[PDB]
Each structure stands twice: as structure tokens, then as C-alpha cells.
Amino acid sequence: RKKVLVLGAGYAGLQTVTKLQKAISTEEAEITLINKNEYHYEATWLHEASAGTLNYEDVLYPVESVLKKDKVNFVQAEVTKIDRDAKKVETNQGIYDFDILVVALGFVSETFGIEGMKDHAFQIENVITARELSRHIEDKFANYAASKEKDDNDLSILVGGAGFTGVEFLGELTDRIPELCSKYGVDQNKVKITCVEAAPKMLPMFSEELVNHAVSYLEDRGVEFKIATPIVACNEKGFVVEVDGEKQQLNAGTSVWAAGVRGSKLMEESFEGVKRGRIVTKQDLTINGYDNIFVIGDCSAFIPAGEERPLPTTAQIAMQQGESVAKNIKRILNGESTEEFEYVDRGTVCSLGSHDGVGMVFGKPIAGKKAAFMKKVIDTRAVFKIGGIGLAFKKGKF
Numbered sequence: 241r242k243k244v245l246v247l248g249a250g251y252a253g254l255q256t257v258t259k260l261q262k263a264i265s266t267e268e269a270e271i272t273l274i275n276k277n278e279y280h281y282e283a284t285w286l287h288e289a290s291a292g293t294l295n296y297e298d299v300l301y302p303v304e305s306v307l308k309k310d311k312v313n314f315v316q317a318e319v320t321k322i323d324r325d326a327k328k329v330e331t332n333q334g335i336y337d338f339d340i341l342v343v344a345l346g347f348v349s350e351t352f353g354i355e356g357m358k359d360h361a362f363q364i365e366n367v368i369t370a371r372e373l374s375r376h377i378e379d380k381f382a383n384y385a386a387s388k389e390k391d392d393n394d395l396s397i398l399v400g401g402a403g404f405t406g407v408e409f410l411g412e413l414t415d416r417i418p419e420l421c422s423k424y425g426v427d428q429n430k431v432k433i434t435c436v437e438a439a440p441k442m443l444p445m446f447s448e449e450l451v452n453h454a455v456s457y458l459e460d461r462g463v464e465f466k467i468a469t470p471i472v473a474c475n476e477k478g479f480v481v482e483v484d485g486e487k488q489q490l491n492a493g494t495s496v497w498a499a500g501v502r503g504s505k506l507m508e509e510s511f512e513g514v515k516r517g518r519i520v521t522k523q524d525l526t527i528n529g530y531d532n533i534f535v536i537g538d539c540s541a542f543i544p545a546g547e548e549r550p551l552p553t554t555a556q557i558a559m560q561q562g563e564s565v566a567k568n569i570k571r572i573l574n575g576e577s578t579e580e581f582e583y584v585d586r587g588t589v590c591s592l593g594s595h596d597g598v599g600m601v602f603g604k605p606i607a608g609k610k611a612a613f614m615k616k617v618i619d620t621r622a623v624f625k626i627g628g629i630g631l632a633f634k635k636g637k638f
């Protein structure tokens with residue numbers, strides 16, 4: 241009865257456990273799942289929870305509800321050390337042994353060495369950061385309404401990054417800001433929403449036609465874009481950016497970083513050859529020198545056969561990776577060889593508020609209500625893929 245230890249109950253880790261628990265027998269192996277929180281959260285819905293267009297309770301569900309308790313021991317604890325050679329993992333609630341390890345500790349903000357970006361900006365990482373950010377935004381509107389001063393910079397928001405997460409967050413701000421304006425007696429014209437991207441292109445994963453749709457959509461709703469504009473620092477006043485190489489202070493009562501993520505900080509402390517919290521795995525998702533250690537999700541850098549660069553960090557690859565791991569753990573336990581992971585690009589949607597978006601579905605570009613409907617089908621299918629039709633009905637987007 242080998243000990244299968246899974247670190248993190250996210251997309252990658254919880255998918256591995258729900259698939260693996262159906263396939264193993266109780267005497268075949270012991271599964272242990274460790275997670276910081278009692279819940280699993282839909283990290284892909286944190287744009288809505290951060291802006292406050294969705295109640296935080298609606299992005300999460302208890303982990304234990306989807307577990308076969310005779311096969312899985314759920315441990316609510318924070319992982320603090322991973323000893324790959326002693327086959328031990330230390331947490332704040334004790335030390336756990338393992339025969340097979342699955343590292344699925346997810347992501348955290350990556351600020352590219354930009355001074356003050358962690359200290360002076362709000363991140364998009366989990367439910368707690370999302371709750372602090374939504375509360376901060378409304379508190380800025382409520383303080384503006386209370387003051388005799390009326391400093392319109394309290395109503396100014398900076399968003400770092402014009403990629404997928406940033407653009408989705410801006411889409412939620414365009415739904416929320418009008419409501420907060422009307423609730424707190426503010427004229428929308430006094431609000432300033434600015435997106436700063438160092439890169440020369442916005443949403444590089446989509447076509448030019450699809451980017452123009454998202455740009456027009458957000459510009460018509462007051463978003464100003466500063467593309468090919470490096471953010472060289474973040475202070476209490478806002479972002480310090482370079483325009484034609486000259487430094488410029490941009491002022492905002494709220495600064496949000498959405499331009500980069502990295503894998504868990506436990507990765508550099510635990511395994512070799514890690515870059516930005518990501519380890520390049522073998523084709524079966526194991527790591528070099530360890531046929532008993534799998535690393536998936538945002539902690540992994542899976543390079544497909546025949547390619548040079550790893551696939552991007554997504555909930556879609558994470559869930560596909562968890563299924564693969566569950567099937568290879570079964571093979572290992574029965575003395576069978578592992579099979580290579582093969583990512584299937586199902587496509588995706590970048591949301592633009594509740595009733596718009598840009599995406600690729602079935603290899604065809606989509607936008608508008610069609611995209612917004614497809615984003616709800618994809619979000620709900622991810623709830624189904626982990627917890628079944630019951631959980632999809634209760635916690636899904638329909």
C-alpha cells in the first residue's frame with residue numbers, strides 16, 4: 241500500500257485525486273491530499289472576485305465534498321519543506337512521508353524585479369487577495385464620497401499587464417465601476433482606468449482581429465491603454481513608467497499587477513533546474529532523477545514533443561495533467577510503464593464583462609455573447625470534470 245502524497249488541491253492536484261481515487265483499490269495505495277485552505281477555489285474566476293462582480297463564496301467549494309474518504313486523507317496544512325531524497329514533506333501540522341509525490345502547489349505573482357510591485361500593488365493570486373482588492377476598490381469610492389477634498393486620484397486604477405488576466409480584470413472593472421459611481425454619487429468621467437503593458441502587443445495568444453475587439457470594447461468603456469510602456473517601479477502613489485525612456489509617475493489610489501505569475505516558491509527550495517517556480521518535466525510529467533515525483537500545473541513547464549518552449553501556465557493544461565498523472569500512478573502501482581502526456585488544445589475565452597469576450601473554440605475565433613456563453617460552458621465543465629454533475633449544478637455558472 242504505497243503512499244501517494246498530493247501537494248495542493250487546485251486544478252492540477254484536485255483533478256489527480258478525483259480521477260485516481262476512482263481507479264485505485266483501497267489496499268493498492270493510500271492517497272494523502274494537503275492544502276492551505278479547507279476549500280478549492282476557481283482561480284480562473286478571481287478577476288470577478290477581485291473586482292467584486294461576484295461574491296467570494298461563489299468561487300470556492302469544500303475539498304472534502306468530492307473525496308472518497310476511505311481512500312483519501314485530506315490534511316488542511318501549509319507545506320513548508322519538501323525533501324525529495326528523504327521522501328518527506330513538512331507542514332505546519334506535521335511531517336508526511338511518501339512513495340509517490342504529486343507537486344501541484346500552483347502560482348504566485350511574478351513582478352520581474354520591479355521595485356515596490358509586491359509592496360505597493362494588489363495581486364491576483366487567491367480568494368484572500370481578491371477579497372482585499374474588491375473591498376479596497378469600494379472603500380476608495382466610499383472615502384471619495386465622504387471627503388470634502390474629492391481627490392479624483394482615489395478614483396484612479398492602474399492595471400499592470402494587457403495579457404489574459406489583466407484584460408479580464410479590466411472587463412470586470414467596466415461592469416463594477418459604473419455601479420459604484422452611481423452608488424457613491426460619482427460622475428464616471430472622473431474615473432481613470434489605465435492598463436500599462438511593457439510588451440509591444442496586448443493578448444499575444446489571439447489574432448489581431450480579436451485583440452481589436454477587446455481593445456475597442458474596453459476603450460469605449462473608459463479604459464486607456466499604454467502598450468510598449470515599461471513599468472520600472474511601483475510606489476504608494478502608483479506606477480513609475482518609462483515613455484520614450486523618460487520616467488513618469490502615474491497616480492492611482494489602486495494599483496493592480498496582472499502581468500506575471502510564477503510557480504510556488506517551494507519549487508526553487510526543493511528541486512533542481514527551476515526557473516520562475518517552474519520545473520521542466522519528462523514527457524510523463526515526472527522530474528529528472530525521480531520516476532516517483534510528478535510536478536504539474538503552474539509548478540510545471542511541459543515542453544511538447546518536437547517543441548522548444550513550454551506550454552503556457554493554464555487551468556486547462558493543469559487539469560489535463562492531473563488526469564495523466566492519475567493514469568500513470570495506476571500504471572506504476574501495477575508495475576506498468578508510464579505513457580507520455582499529450583496536451584489537447586480545447587481552446588479558450590478571455591471574458592470582457594458578463595456578456596462579451598474574445599476566444600478560440602473548435603479552432604474558430606469567437607466574440608460577444610457567443611464567447612460569454614462559451615466561457616460559462618468551459619467554467620462549468622471544469623467544475624464537472626473535478627466534482628461531477630451535482631457540483632456543476634450547484635457551483636457552476638448556470
Ligand SMILES: Cc1cc2nc3c(=O)[nH]c(=O)nc-3n(C[C@H](O)[C@H](O)[C@H](O)COP(=O)(O)OP(=O)(O)OC[C@H]3O[C@@H](n4cnc5c(N)ncnc54)[C@H](O)[C@@H]3O)c2cc1C
Nearest residue numbers: 248250251252276283287318319346537538553554555556
Ligand atoms: C483571474 C485569472 C484568470 C484566469 N483565466 C484562465 C482561463 O480562462 N483559463 C485557463 O486555463 N487558465 C486561466 N488562468 C490560469 C489558471 O488559474 C492557473 O494556471 C491555474 O490556477 C493553475 O492550476 P494549479 O493547480 O497549478 O494551481 P492553483 O490553482 O494556484 O492551486 C494551487 C493550490 O495549492 C494550494 N497551496 C499553494 N501553496 C501551498 C502550500 N505551501 N501548502 C499548501 N497548499 C498550498 C493553494 O491554496 C491552491 O489550493 C487564470 C488565472 C487568473 C488569476
